[PDB]
Amino acid sequence: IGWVTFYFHWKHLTLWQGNVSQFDESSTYLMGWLRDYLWLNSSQLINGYNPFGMNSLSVWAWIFLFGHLVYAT
Amino acid sequence: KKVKIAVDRNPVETSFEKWAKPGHFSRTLSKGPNTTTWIWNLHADAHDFDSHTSDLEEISRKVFSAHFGQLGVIFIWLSGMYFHGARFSNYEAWLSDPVHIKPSAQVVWPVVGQEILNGDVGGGFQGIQITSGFFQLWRASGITSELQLYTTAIGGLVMAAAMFFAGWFHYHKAAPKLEWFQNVESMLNHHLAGLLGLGSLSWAGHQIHVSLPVNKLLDAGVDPKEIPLPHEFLLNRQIMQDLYPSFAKGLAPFFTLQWGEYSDFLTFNGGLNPVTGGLWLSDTAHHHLAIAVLFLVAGHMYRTNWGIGHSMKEILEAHKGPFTGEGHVGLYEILTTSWHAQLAINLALFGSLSIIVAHHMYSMPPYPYLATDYGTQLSLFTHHNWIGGFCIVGAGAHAAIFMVRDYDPTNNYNNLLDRVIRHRDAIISHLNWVCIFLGFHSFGLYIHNDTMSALGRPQDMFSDTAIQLQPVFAQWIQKTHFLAPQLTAPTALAATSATWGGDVVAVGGKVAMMPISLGTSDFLVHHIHAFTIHVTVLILLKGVLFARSSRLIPDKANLGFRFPCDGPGRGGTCQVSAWDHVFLGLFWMYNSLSIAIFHFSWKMQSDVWGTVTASGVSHITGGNFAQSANTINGWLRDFLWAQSSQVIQSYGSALSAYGLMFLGAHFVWAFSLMFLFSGRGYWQELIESIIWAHSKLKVAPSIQPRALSITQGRAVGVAHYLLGGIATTWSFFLARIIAV
Amino acid sequence: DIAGLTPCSESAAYAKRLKNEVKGLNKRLKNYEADSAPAIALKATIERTQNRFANYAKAGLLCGADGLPHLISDPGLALKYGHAGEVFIPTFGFLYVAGWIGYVGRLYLNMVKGEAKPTEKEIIIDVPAALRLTWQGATWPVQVVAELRANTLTEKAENITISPR
Amino acid sequence: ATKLFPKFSQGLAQDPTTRRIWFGLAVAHDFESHDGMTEENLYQKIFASHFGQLAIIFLWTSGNLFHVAWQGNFEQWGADPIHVRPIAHAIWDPHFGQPAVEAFTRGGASGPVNISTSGVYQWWYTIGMRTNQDLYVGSVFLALVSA
Amino acid sequence: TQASLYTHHQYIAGFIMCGAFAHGAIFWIRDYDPEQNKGNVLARMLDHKEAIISHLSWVSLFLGFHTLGLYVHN
Amino acid sequence: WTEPTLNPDTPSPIFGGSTGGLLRKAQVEEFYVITWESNKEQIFEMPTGGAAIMRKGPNLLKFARKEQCLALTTQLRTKFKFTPCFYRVYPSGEVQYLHPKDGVYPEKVNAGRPGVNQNFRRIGENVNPIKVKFTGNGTMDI
Amino acid sequence: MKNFTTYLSTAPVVALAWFTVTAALLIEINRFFPDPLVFS
Ligand code: CLA
Ligand code: CLA
Ligand code: CLA
Ligand code: CLA
Ligand code: CLA
Ligand code: CLA
Ligand code: CLA
Ligand SMILES: CCCCCCCC(=O)O
């Protein structure tokens, strides 16, 4: 399911941003899936709360880390 | 009682007949294979000499010979490094311009487009930037040409052949008797004075005759191909006298006790050389000279064949008090009739030494143009820290092995060994409590900062801006050693390292060593290290204490060291053995060391490493460790995610090999979770169905395919788990630090 | 043609991919003297690239807007339109070697079965007899079929041990 | 001595360890194993258990409608569904700091709220709902069904 | 919404499927009469249980060895 | 043979004490007492942790687990080739001669032992779970 | 030599040899016929 829900999200994020070539090329190799998808999109979520302030995405950043904690436990 | 060479002529014959009989060493595996397990067993039981035979004479001869081969392969490795650094290297080009030329000593063949790995390291050379610190090592050895590397390589190969020959000779020919090996007083007397003392004095000879004049001329701007060759310094006194006027007198000042005259090649300057950014070579020469006299004198303490001297057995017995019963009386025999006891103690100190060396070498870069080579520094600190952490885990394992295999309840009545096995539930219980405390009171003030920051209450956090927790004790020790040279150590012209405090050593517009400042985040990360160190100890120590027995299973000694579980009863008894306390104490070692290497990687890039510009220095990350490390998100957004850009974007560049390895490492780490989370029961039956398909087409293998043993699967998973994680960091660190 | 996949010979992006990729190596050649081994090497990489980025198009490799050659799997499409060299023809090549390796293996297994201790000829392989059976797998398809049409390739269901249902 | 927690499992009830508490929660809806279980009684118990799950589903749905109506922007979102962001509920966190109280005020509200990603808004619009009353009436109805 | 709705159902569906086979195995042990089901399509499944299991092994290996190999190759 | 009676005044082996012995269970629940007869004063290993000097002639040691007592029993029966016997002292004082409870150590056949828990069918002749469904009875026991 | 050849026949040695030859063959093939994407 992880692979299927990651394919949906990228195929569609590239559809919605207008950069369909992004998926049509980066998806071919796995490195594109990590840097162009997981790493690039995670840029905002992780910045929900930084030493300079916090925005409405703070709960998701807190949960994102919370998920890692429960997963590791 | 006479200390003498005892040898048995031509014991083991030299033949290949045994080579053709796999498993000749074990009574059980000599009967050939019938299941596919024997294959994995003949390897998991080939170095366990104690299991092969009960004679401690043979086990020792095997151990002594084995070590020889190890040395041989070490020499081969070292010789190969010099050869690769002789033919396929840019060492000579680097010598002229050490700052702007990156070291390289690995060239890839032009095939499968892998030639991309041959990046432009500068100096008319296209290869792979090495991070082993060999170029700077050779420079401080005086090596100024690739003829001195080629000769060294040849010498190393010759030594290698001597080592293997010695191993075969001292095993198949002149095999020492047990009485020879158990002369510890002699070994220590010869390893302290002859090995360490003479080893340092011999180096203090090279450093004083070859490394000092050559390095002085190199730092003076003289072209490497115009410096007088080393031998000319020895023979031509005039050349050495010009560089060091004290060679005008000779060895007279030494015998006349006027050592002071030699205060131009033997000095206590302290600090770092302003030209190369590394400890003065003069100070290193004086250190090895002193270290030598110490070891050489230390070699005259234990008694051998004459009268003068001490008896370690008597000393240990003499040390007993009103609380520790009989005292250390009974450990001498343990440590002269057991290899597992000795190994455990040896590995522990040896492994800890590796970490200590990494801290000192990075804090006081010992080689020229080493501190400004950030990749080399990082790669060395991370390396030694792991190499050491592994040894320590081995120390715990062998300790347990001795307890379950070589412990004799009769010899240890009221020893401090029986008196500790008799309060194991006080030691373990208290250590468990401190671990839980350190856990909450170290990782909690991190989740608290996370929650307080997310809730938009950043004045209610634990930081230098809010509820501060400065490491005052660490901050005072830093000042007692920065103002030490003016009071505690007057003769020293400067402090031991710039880390304690002072100006910033700059070489080539880069920060060689900059005073490190400890803040709240340093306090928080340091206590986090303590918690991990304590936990790791708890798992390994627990295994050693209960290695023989416990309230659960009061006969583990009769079960062994590598036994999976007593049974599914008693509510489950899996991983009760001491091998399974080492199995788990490896993951925690990885967790404990991982944070340390991350702490060094981030602190340095943020507070030390950078370019010294007009009025100010530009750190690799602009000094964001302090405010960004008090939370776990900062360790993911400003460290992991931010610094991972170089490795994830290394594709298409000379660093593309690290991007590939970075992912490959993730695959290996994840693949390990199929053996760490599963069970043979599922695989054994699955194999049965596969065998059926094979038996239908009449292609079934004669040897019975069997799933991995319970202990084997535990080993395979932990092995891949450690290999994957360390490889991921190795790619991350190297591609980050080499790119920036 | 096929699925909107333009031929790389008519693929502009494929041409740009050449221009920009050889430019990226003709900028690494400048920072090196004309005769240095570094430069002899980068000039080989430029020649090898210019040969590959043409051997592909000359093979009629249809590529999309990305400019990266694509392969056709359908036998009918690959054959009808001369794209058999991709996937199609390669498919049988692997199958022949694959069956060759498997057939030779079973030939050896069934020879060591019976022979004295068959388990000690799997660890210490009999390299002589293993070298007398390798070429026997050249005509494996002929021999394999002759075994199907003789009932000797498989075992009787009443001679294979099965797990309790 | 024997405990009562694991009424169904006397073995767990007599268990002196803590496992009785853990297993008592696990072997709880495995009636086929319960001490003294008849096939008819098993079916009757399951049939009733089904009603309980159906009460939760309707009670769960009613709560969503109630919070969307009491603490939501349905009418506003309905007016501009391509600009207004559906509000799921309000964040009454007695721990929130003032910046948290400010940043979570979105989708048109007077306090910190949570935008919904369930898509109930789009669905309830398409099916005919237009006001908050439609939601209140529906919630009461479904709540009665749950009862 | 679209993304969080696809992911919700696709994950819930996966857990439900695991329960399907799970309860199926429970049926085989708690409620299967091997004498009444004798020669029925349900009893002739365990007869070729190895065939079904082994053939699912070959397909998984083939998909795995190749699907990944053409990702590492790229 | 007559079930030996415990002499709770039997010299106990020499041992300083360990944080690994009896707890509340010994009094609230129950404990066990192994006894043997040595030929010489010898150091043995305790099934709880440590070493102890057994005394010459009668010896008596108390444990909180039967496996612990039996462990020492085998140790004495093998390392010293002794014949140890242990009981189960309940909180009321009810001593119950646990081993060998016959005179002949279990391994050795002796007439006068009835057969308990002995199914007279191949393990593969047990019924299906469905035949014992809703019966609350195991397939093996049925 | 009969027993040395026996050792050189053991699985680990034979596999090391077979693979080295196969690997070298593929390497040499690409060395003379590089970039083999299609069978043309
Ligand atoms: C060079 C000739 C030679 C010959 C003919 C023999 C023959 C023999 N030796 Mg021997 N030995 C030799 C050299 C030789 N040895 C040398 C130079 C050393 C010093 C290291 C030893 C040390 C030694 C020991 C300690 C023992 C033997 C033993 C034996 C006997 C059985 C074990 C065996 O060798 O099987 C074959 C074993 C192997 C093929 C293993 C090879 C290991 C070598 C030393 C290095 C491999 C390390 C490897 C590179 C690690 C990296 C792997 C990585 C790259 C994947 C056998 C008759 C054993 C014995 O006496 O019988 C019980 C015994 O315990 N030898
Ligand atoms: C001045 C005397 C002297 C010196 C310098 C050494 C030095 C050494 N011994 Mg040693 N030893 C000595 C006396 C001495 N020993 C005596 C008197 C005894 C008997 C009580 C022992 C018993 C002993 C044992 C049991 C072992 C050692 C080992 C070692 C090595 C440590 C492993 C290592 O770090 O490898 C580092 C390698 C180097 C530093 C390169 C130097 C290597 C040279 C060739 C070693 C030569 C030592 C020898 C005394 C010289 C004479 C050889 C001659 C007969 C040909 C080391 C080189 C260990 C070993 O064998 O490791 C393989 C080990 O197992 N020794
Ligand atoms: C001087 C150091 C030293 C020495 C002399 C020994 C000696 C010994 N150890 Mg040991 N050990 C050490 C350090 C040391 N250890 C350390 C630091 C650790 C912590 C990790 C351990 C953990 C350890 C364990 C868990 C065990 C031993 C065991 C043993 C005994 C038998 C080992 C064996 O079966 O050989 C066989 C050697 C092998 C099978 C090689 C293992 C396969 C390697 C390690 C995996 C490959 C790693 C590498 C990175 C792969 C590269 C990539 C790959 C694709 C090529 C033996 C007497 C065994 C024992 O006695 O238990 C009863 C045992 O189980 N040791
Ligand atoms: C993220 C995963 C994770 C976490 C959080 C832990 C946590 C812990 N491990 Mg562990 N471990 C893990 C993974 C993890 N491990 C894995 C994968 C392995 C396999 C190698 C191990 C193997 C292992 C061993 C062998 C041991 C531990 C031990 C411990 C405990 C150390 C004692 C301590 O410091 O207490 C402090 C508590 C924490 C650090 C957790 C912080 C959680 C916060 C602070 C709690 C705040 C809750 C708050 C009040 C809200 C309440 C809400 C309410 C609804 C509940 C600790 C709780 C040791 C142990 O058991 O104790 C000595 C030990 O023996 N671990
Ligand atoms: C591995 C599974 C597989 C799959 C999914 C397909 C799928 C397809 N094949 Mg095909 N094929 C396969 C195996 C497969 N093939 C094998 C093993 C062979 C060797 C015998 C062939 C030989 C083959 C031929 C000769 C042709 C196709 C063709 C086609 C396409 C349309 C034909 C059709 O309706 O059904 C599938 C048809 C077959 C499996 C074989 C029968 C040949 C078809 C029915 C003749 C149709 C001709 C006509 C031009 C097709 C119209 C397609 C439409 C877009 C205009 C279609 C996408 C046609 C095509 O698109 O090529 C131009 C066609 O001409 N295939
Ligand atoms: C003579 C050797 C041989 C042969 C003929 C086969 C044949 C077969 N294997 Mg098999 N296998 C082998 C060795 C062999 N295997 C070995 C050594 C292993 C351990 C790694 C496996 C592990 C394995 C698994 C896990 C599975 C199979 C499966 C299968 C079947 C699926 C067809 C396939 O794609 O192959 C598949 C082959 C592999 C997946 C790996 C083996 C590939 C090796 C390299 C070939 C063996 C070469 C051999 C060493 C040559 C010996 C020559 C002699 C002179 C020494 C098939 C009939 C599948 C199955 O059961 O189908 C229902 C499956 O699930 N094999
Ligand atoms: C990243 C982690 C990971 C990976 C990669 C896999 C991969 C796989 N799992 Mg798995 N699994 C995992 C985690 C993982 N799992 C976890 C955490 C669990 C929970 C415990 C499980 C539980 C699980 C079960 C229950 C089963 C699997 C099965 C499988 C296999 C499915 C068949 C297949 O695709 O064959 C494809 C083959 C490959 C992808 C291997 C690639 C070829 C290799 C790498 C190249 C050969 C070696 C190479 C030349 C060099 C390396 C060796 C060299 C150093 C000597 C597959 C290889 C099934 C299975 O066993 O298959 C029958 C199955 O039953 N897994
Ligand atoms: C570190 C404490 C010093 C040891 C005290 C010994 C007293 C004595 O021997 O009388």
Helices in chain F by DSSP H: which ranges?
24-28, 66-79
Best mutation site among C79, C101, C124, C134 for testing chain G: the one with the most G CBs within 10 Å? Answer: C124
Helices in D82-131 by DSSP H: which ranges?
98-103, 120-126
Query: Which secondary-structure segment (H or E) carries F59?
Result: strand F57-63
Resolution value in angstroms: 2.8
Kindly report the length of chain G.
40
C147 burial class (0-12, 13-18, 19+ CB within 10 angstroms)?
A: middle
Among protein residues, the one with the nearest Cα to ligand 6's atom 40 is E61
For chain F positions 80-139, those within 8 Å of chain D (CB to CB) are 133-134, 136
What ligand is nearest to the CA atom of residue C82? Answer: 5
Q: What long-range pairs does F111-114 form, CB within 8 A, spacing at least 24?
A: none
Query: Which secondary-structure segment (H or E) carries F43?
Result: strand F42-45
Tokens (6 digits) for B418: 């029986």
Query: Is it the case that chain D and chain B have 3 or more CB pairs lying under 8 Å apart?
Result: yes
Q: Is D39 on the interface with E (CB under 8 A)?
A: no
- Amino acid at site G37: L
- Bridge-partner residues for F37, per DSSP? F58
B382 burial class (0-12, 13-18, 19+ CB within 10 angstroms)?
A: buried
Quote the DSSP letter at residue E39.
S
Q: Cα(B194) to centroid of ligand 2, in Å? A: 9
Beta strands in D3-146 (DSSP E): 87-90, 113-115
The b-or-e profile of B175-214 (16+ CB within 10 A means b, else e) is: bbeeebbebebbeebbebbeebbebbbebbeebbbbbbbb
E27 to chain D: closest CA residue: D32
Q: What long-range pairs does A4-8 form, CB within 8 A, spacing at least 24?
A: A4/E10, A5/E6, A5/E7, A5/E10, A5/E11, A6/A33, A6/A37, A8/E3, A8/E6, A8/E7, A8/E10
Query: CA geometry: angle at G34 spanning G31 and G40, to 5°?
Result: 140
Q: Which residues of B touch G11 (CB under 8 A)?
A: 39
Kindly report the length of chain B.
740
Q: Are the beta carbons of A54 and B628 separated by less than 8 Å?
A: no
Provide DSSP, B209-232.
IIIHHHHHHHHTT--GGGSPPHHH
CB-based contacts of B335, cutoff 8 Å, min separation 6: B184, B341, B342, B345
Which of B586, B617, B543, B595 is CA-nearest to residue B721? B586
Q: Which residues of C touch B698 (CB under 8 A)?
A: 106, 110, 153-155
- Bridge-partner residues for G10, per DSSP? C124
Q: Which residues of C touch B118 (CB under 8 A)?
A: 41
For chain A positions 39-58, those within 8 Å of chain D (CB to CB) are 53-56, 58
Beta strands in D1-147 (DSSP E): 87-90, 113-115
Q: How was this structure determined?
A: cryo-EM
Query: Is it the case that chain C and chain D have 3 or more CB pairs lying under 8 Å apart?
Result: no
B43 to chain G: closest CA residue: G12
Q: Are the beta carbons of B703 and C36 separated by less than 8 Å?
A: no
Which of F98, F91, F73 is CA-nearest to residue F31? F91
Query: Which secondary-structure segment (H or E) carries B350?
Result: helix B339-363
CB-based contacts of C84, cutoff 8 Å, min separation 6: C78
Q: Are the beta carbons of C64 and A24 separated by less than 8 Å?
A: yes
B393 lines ligand 3 (CB under 6 A): yes
Q: Which residues of C touch E49 (CB under 8 A)?
A: 163, 165
Beta strands in C55-165 (DSSP E): 62-63
Distance between CA atoms of residues B582 and B380, nearest Å? 26
Residue B226 phi, psi dihedral angles, 5° rounding = -125, -5
Whether the CB-CB separation of B505 and B608 falls below 8 Å is answered with no
Q: Which residues of D touch F134 (CB under 8 A)?
A: 32, 37-39, 42
Question: B98 to chain G, minimum CA–CA distance in Å?
Answer: 36
G33 burial class (0-12, 13-18, 19+ CB within 10 angstroms)?
A: exposed
Residue E7's region, left for phi above 0, alpha for psi from -120 to 50, else beta, is: alpha
Whether the CB-CB separation of C62 and C10 falls below 8 Å is answered with no
Residue B529's region, left for phi above 0, alpha for psi from -120 to 50, else beta, is: alpha
Question: C157 to chain G, minimum CA–CA distance in Å?
Answer: 32
Tokens (6 digits) for C5: 């996949």
Which of B724, B616, B643 is CA-nearest to residue B374? B643
Distance between CA atoms of residues B288 and B284, nearest Å? 6
Nearest atom in ligand 4 to A73's CA: 2
Whether the CB-CB separation of B550 and F46 falls below 8 Å is answered with no
Distance between CA atoms of residues B406 and B286, nearest Å? 45
Among protein residues, the one with the nearest Cα to ligand 4's atom 10 is A73
Whether the CB-CB separation of C125 and G14 falls below 8 Å is answered with yes
Query: CA geometry: angle at D80 spanning D77 and D85, to 5°?
Result: 45
Residue F80 phi, psi dihedral angles, 5° rounding = -120, 0
Tokens (6 digits) for B554: 């009061």
CB-based contacts of B232, cutoff 8 Å, min separation 6: B239
CA gyration radius for chain F?
Answer: 20
Q: Is C157 on the interface with E (CB under 8 A)?
A: no
What ligand is nearest to the CA atom of residue B319? Answer: 8
Strand pairing report for A53-54 and F85-89: unpaired
Best mutation site among B412, B542, B555 for testing chain F: the one with the most F CBs within 10 Å? Answer: B555
Distance between CA atoms of residues B72 and B170, nearest Å? 14
User: After which residues does a break in chain C occur, C–N more than 2.5 Å?
Assistant: none
Q: Cα(B395) to centroid of ligand 6, in Å? A: 41
- Amino acid at site B233: F
Q: Is F129 on the interface with E (CB under 8 A)?
A: yes
Straight-line distance from the first to the last Cα atom of chain C, in angstroms, rounded to the nearest whole number: 55
Which member of E3, E11, E74 has the closest CB to residue A9? E3
Tokens (6 digits) for D57: 């589903």
E65 lines ligand 7 (CB under 6 A): yes
C1 lines ligand 5 (CB under 6 A): no
The b-or-e profile of A30-67 (16+ CB within 10 A means b, else e) is: ebbbbbbbeeeeeeeebbbbbbeebbbbbbebbebbee
Distance between CA atoms of residues D119 and D136, nearest Å? 18
- Bridge-partner residues for F89, per DSSP? F31, F95
Whether the CB-CB separation of B102 and B121 falls below 8 Å is answered with yes
**Probe ligand 2: pick from B63, B67, B192, B339, max atoms within 8 Å of CB?**
B67
Is the dihedral angle over the CA atoms B197, B198, B201, B203 positive or is it negative? negative
Tokens (6 digits) for A65: 């880390």
Straight-line distance from the first to the last Cα atom of chain B, in angstroms, rounded to the nearest whole number: 63
Residues of chain B that touch chain D, judged by Cβ-Cβ distance less than 8 Å:
452, 454-457, 460, 571
Distance between CA atoms of residues B196 and B179, nearest Å? 24
Question: D11 to chain B, minimum CA–CA distance in Å?
Answer: 14
Residue B302 phi, psi dihedral angles, 5° rounding = -75, 150
Quote the DSSP letter at residue C136.
G
Whether the CB-CB separation of C8 and C63 falls below 8 Å is answered with yes
Query: Which secondary-structure segment (H or E) carries C45?
Result: helix C37-58
Q: Which residues of C touch E34 (CB under 8 A)?
A: 165
CA gyration radius for chain D?
Answer: 23
Quote the DSSP letter at residue B7.
E
B378 burial class (0-12, 13-18, 19+ CB within 10 angstroms)?
A: buried
Q: Which residues of B touch D97 (CB under 8 A)?
A: 452, 455-457, 460
Distance between CA atoms of residues B462 and B468, nearest Å? 6
Q: Which residues of C touch B110 (CB under 8 A)?
A: 41, 44-45
B690 to chain E: closest CA residue: E54
User: After which residues does a break in chain E occur, C–N more than 2.5 Å?
Assistant: none
Q: Measuring CA to CA, how many Å separate D68 from each of D61, D113, D118, D138?
A: 11, 11, 12, 12
Residue B279's region, left for phi above 0, alpha for psi from -120 to 50, else beta, is: beta
Q: Is C123 on the interface with B (CB under 8 A)?
A: yes
Tokens 């090279």 map to which residue?
B206
Query: Is it the case that chain G and chain A have 3 or more CB pairs lying under 8 Å apart?
Result: no
Straight-line distance from the first to the last Cα atom of chain F, in angstroms, rounded to the nearest whole number: 37
Tokens (6 digits) for B237: 């006194």
Distance between CA atoms of residues B67 and B177, nearest Å? 17
Which member of B456, B636, B637 has the closest CB to residue A54? B456
